Amino acid sequence: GVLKIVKVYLAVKRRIQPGDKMAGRHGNKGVISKINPIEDMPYDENGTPV
């Protein structure tokens, strides 16, 4: 019944969004909620923030 198959391939890129599951190696699940800028992250005495 078929004449021929045409089957194309598409690739994508995907980054951290709200609602993207996130966990360590101990069962500590997490919904990533909010993406904060670098200033309003808490920062140590020597500059490099959390």
Binding site: A11, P37, I38, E39, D40, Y43, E45, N46, G47
Partner: protein, 311 residues
């Protein structure tokens, strides 16, 4: 009042990538008032240059592979991100690269311009492994701020792009890590005053005084706003362009009348007595004068603009 203002002291550069800069003397409670307020501004909206697009031969898309390379193609994207260029007079430039032979291309290899100051010579781009290879890449450089990686540029603007251009994810911010510490400045009667030691660790492409001087241009713009803040269309056309019948209006422009304001300021009795008017053209003159609301010989104030041309 017993006010006081702080001033420039010094700039001590460790290198192009590290420096320190003081500021003194502030009064009580002022050191964190201006101190953190710059740390939130020198990271947020400090403008600088970055890499916007790359176009490159022999490859049609970033997820292919190129012959004669060690690292992959989007690793060249993830190495051309951390380049640092200081453009003096252009918010858009280009640079070309032509390279052959086995050997790692560094930033010295690219063909420069007279006004893009290069910061790092050896920020490693690629690795060549076969001698017959050749490279043509054209690195677009813009100057902006923030982390808009032109993914909104493709999403706010839908121009017809040519096939072959690769879009770079860019961070325009030159400032990386900035912190401060507040020690007591010594004025003999005012022991309460303090200093504002301000550090800075960035890449190149920045003079630090311009960073601090641009901050007060930002703040005092908002700090001003809390102190200071608390004619008929068919009358203005040619007589030929009034859109009338066969011969009623173009007969009027051989009287040199090429504006409708000049029409209403002629005597009707002697305009219809020239040997070119016809006696059924009378009603079209009576049309556009009565439909608009004008009288015979009534003086219009200024019928021409500063543009005055005939045919």
């Amino acid at each position: 009042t017993e006010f006081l203002k702080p001033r420039l002291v010094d700039i001590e550069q460790v290198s192009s990538t590290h420096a320190k800069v003081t500021l003194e003397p502030l009064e009580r409670g002022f050191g964190h008032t201006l101190g953190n307020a710059l740390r939130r501004i020198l990271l947020s909206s400090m403008p600088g240059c970055a890499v916007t697009e790359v176009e490159i031969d022999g490859v049609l898309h970033e997820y292919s592979t190129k012959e004669g390379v060690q690292e992959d193609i989007l690793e060249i994207l993830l190495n051309l991100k951390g380049l640092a260029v200081r453009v003096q007079g252009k918010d858009e430039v280009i640079l070309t690269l032509n390279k052959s032979g086995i050997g790692p291309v560094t930033a010295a290899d690219i063909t420069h311009d007279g006004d893009v100051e290069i910061v790092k010579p050896q920020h490693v781009i690629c690795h060549l492994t076969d001698e017959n290879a050749s490279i043509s890449m054209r690195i677009k450089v813009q100057r902006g701020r923030g982390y808009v990686p032109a993914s909104t540029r493709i999403h706010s603007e839908e121009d017809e792009r040519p096939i072959g251009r690769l879009l770079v994810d860019a961070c325009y911010s030159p400032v990386e890590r900035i912190a401060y510490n507040v020690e007591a400045a010594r004025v003999e009667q005012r022991t309460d005053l303090d200093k504002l030691v301000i550090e800075m660790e960035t890449n190149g492409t920045i003079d630090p005084e311009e960073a601090i001087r641009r901050a007060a241009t930002i703040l005092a713009e908002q700090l001003e706003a809390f102190v200071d803040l608390r004619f008929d269309p068919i009358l203005l056309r040619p007589v030929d362009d009034l859109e009338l019948t066969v011969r009623s209006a173009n007969c009027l422009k051989a009287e040199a009348i090429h504006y409708i304001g000049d029409l209403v300021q002629r005597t009707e009795v002697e305009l219809l007595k020239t040997p070119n008017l016809g006696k059924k053209s009378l009603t079209e003159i009576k049309d556009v004068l009565a439909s608009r609301g004008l009288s015979l010989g009534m003086r219009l104030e200024n019928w021409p603009p500063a543009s005055i041309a005939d045919e």
